């Protein structure tokens, strides 16, 4: 229903649709963890060795053998169970404990439940309508002509990532740079590509899922006995595409910051892995990748990755999720469709983000919610 003379005002930085999506995702996520196994019994002393019988050297410090005592009956009859763990999940007290047993409850993700993103459309309730801009080269803010109506938004996949924006959608013609306060270095800059950069990621290790009885109808999923060579997880990123993509970004940054200056890209900054590395979970396992190999320039690329099983979902503390191991190997392909950047004459840009909402805000910059109020008056010729 194109609205021929409508020039409506938008502000993506105040879009409550983003806030709703954030809240809804968290709620769905949390309710999916009510059933299935709680892992309190794993908060025991572990006895760990370094797992070195079939490794490449770059993986030498990554796995722990960790033997421990756990039971199946309230019989005071514990059994030895061992599981390999990634180093990032285990902290030294030879004796070790799981990293989160000091601060939070650990819940096993239920292995039969998938979180694979499916595009979701948001639809207006009766009495409401969604308006959108069709303009190209739109700021995401301010007025726009060529406003049309929406019953349901286009579908958006609820992909959660850090630093790089994956999948979602592409800009209509040229990479777009959008920000709330462009001259304010305290804000994130959302950059939307007009063409994807293809990224191939993998966990090239043929693993085994080990089912451990933990209680009366309860199972714990252990991992171990990896078949074949143990190798480091990684992403390949096509190199030429990445370089061309930055050239486009640089040109647009210059339009905003001056076409007579020089900018560079730095390897982000310090902080926790949830902040400093690229994060995604394809295949069901959580990957943390080093983007220092991408953001290194002044105006294939293999990115090493680490894997964690105990995840503190960004949205809160006091709880942790345990991701069961995935049987076999993981391979996935995705589209980098944008960046979350911050800025520190010349200027320097760094990968940032980490706030889950930026991954939806970057899609919901075209839609606005309004209430219909179909009653009014006017002077005219109309006498009882």
């Amino acid at each position: 229903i194109h609205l021929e003379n409508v020039t409506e005002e938008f502000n993506m930085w105040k879009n409550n649709m983003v806030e709703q999506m954030h809240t809804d995702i968290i709620s769905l996520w949390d309710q999916s963890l009510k059933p299935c196994v709680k892992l309190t019994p794993l908060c025991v002393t572990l006895q760990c060795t370094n797992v070195t019988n079939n490794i490449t050297d770059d993986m030498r410090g990554e796995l722990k053998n960790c033997s421990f005592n756990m039971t199946t009956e309230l019989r005071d009859k514990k059994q030895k169970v061992y599981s390999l763990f990634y180093r990032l999940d285990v902290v030294q007290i030879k004796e070790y404990r799981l990293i989160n047993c000091n601060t939070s409850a650990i819940t096993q993700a239920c292995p039969k439940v998938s979180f694979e993103p499916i595009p979701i459309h948001y639809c207006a309730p009766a009495g409401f309508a969604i308006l959108k801009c069709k303009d190209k080269k739109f700021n995401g803010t301010g007025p726009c002509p060529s406003v049309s109506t929406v019953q349901c938004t286009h579908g958006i996949k609820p992909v959660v990532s850090t630093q790089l924006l994956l999948n979602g959608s592409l800009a209509e013609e040229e990479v777009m740079i959008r920000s709330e306060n462009i001259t304010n270095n305290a804000k994130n800059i959302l950059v939307q590509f007009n063409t994807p950069v293809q990224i191939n990621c993998t966990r090239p290790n043929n693993n085994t899922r080990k089912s451990i009885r933990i209680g009366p109808g309860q199972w714990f999923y252990a991992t171990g006995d990896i078949i074949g060579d143990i190798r480091q997880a990684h992403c390949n990123v096509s190199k030429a595409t990445w370089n061309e993509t930055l050239g486009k970004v640089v040109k647009q940054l210059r339009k905003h910051f001056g076409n007579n200056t020089i900018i560079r890209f730095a390897n982000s900054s310090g902080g926790d892995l949830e902040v400093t590395t690229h994060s995604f979970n394809c295949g069901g396992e959580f990957f943390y990748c080093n983007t220092s190999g991408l953001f290194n320039s002044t105006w294939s690329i293999t990115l090493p990755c680490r894997i964690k099983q105990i995840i503190n979902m960004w949205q809160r503390i006091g709880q942790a999720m345990y991701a069961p191991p995935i049987q076999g190997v993981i391979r996935c392909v995705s589209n980098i469709t944008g960046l979350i950047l911050t800025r520190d004459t010349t200027e320097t840009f760094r990968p940032g983000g980490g706030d889950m909402r930026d991954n939806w805000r970057s899609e919901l910059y075209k839609y606005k919610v309004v209430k219909i109020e179909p009653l009014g008056v006017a002077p005219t010729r109309c006498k009882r």
Partner: antibody
Amino acid sequence: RQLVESGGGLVQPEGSLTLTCKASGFSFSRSQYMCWVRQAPGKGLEWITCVYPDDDTPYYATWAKGRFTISKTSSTTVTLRLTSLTEADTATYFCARTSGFGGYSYAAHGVDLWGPGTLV
Amino acid sequence: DIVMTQTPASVSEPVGGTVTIKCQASHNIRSYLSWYQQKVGQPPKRLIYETSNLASGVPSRFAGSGSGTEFTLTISDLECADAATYYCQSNFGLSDSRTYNFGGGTEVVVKG
């Protein structure tokens, strides 16, 4: 950067000795892998043992497992303890360093540096 | 556990000739084999670090190839200076059994 062996000299049957090798000019690091190889004066070369300096894991040839011990003693030195010596073990012993790939053994390129051999 | 056999144990060829040196492994070693040249009184020099890839400073005359369990050198333009014992080294790795068996070698005599 040169490996230098010491502790040579022949020892009578059923005796023991320990060989010493120093990294003159360098320290051990994760890309380096240290090994010992011996060559009897009338023979080719026989691999004995290796150690990886970041966690000091020893590796041994089956024939050597019950007689030879390899151990790191410093960031620049390693030693090899030899016991139950026989006259058949008379050989020139070499200290050597290998290199390789992070993606597959930092030894998968073989020896880039050899010390002068020392005979016992 | 992986053992390599050399052949011919020894050869003799006039200066300017070419020698083929063969090494046969008991197991597939995924082309990680290295080759060495030993002069009398010296530790062996590395010629090849990875099947066909020559070590720095080594002339192209020492090129070689192979796959699987079968590897060879073809050393061309032999000089009396090139007479040496040549050796085949396994370098398989990964396991905790390792055993980087140094295989046997061959004697190459270059005749003037």
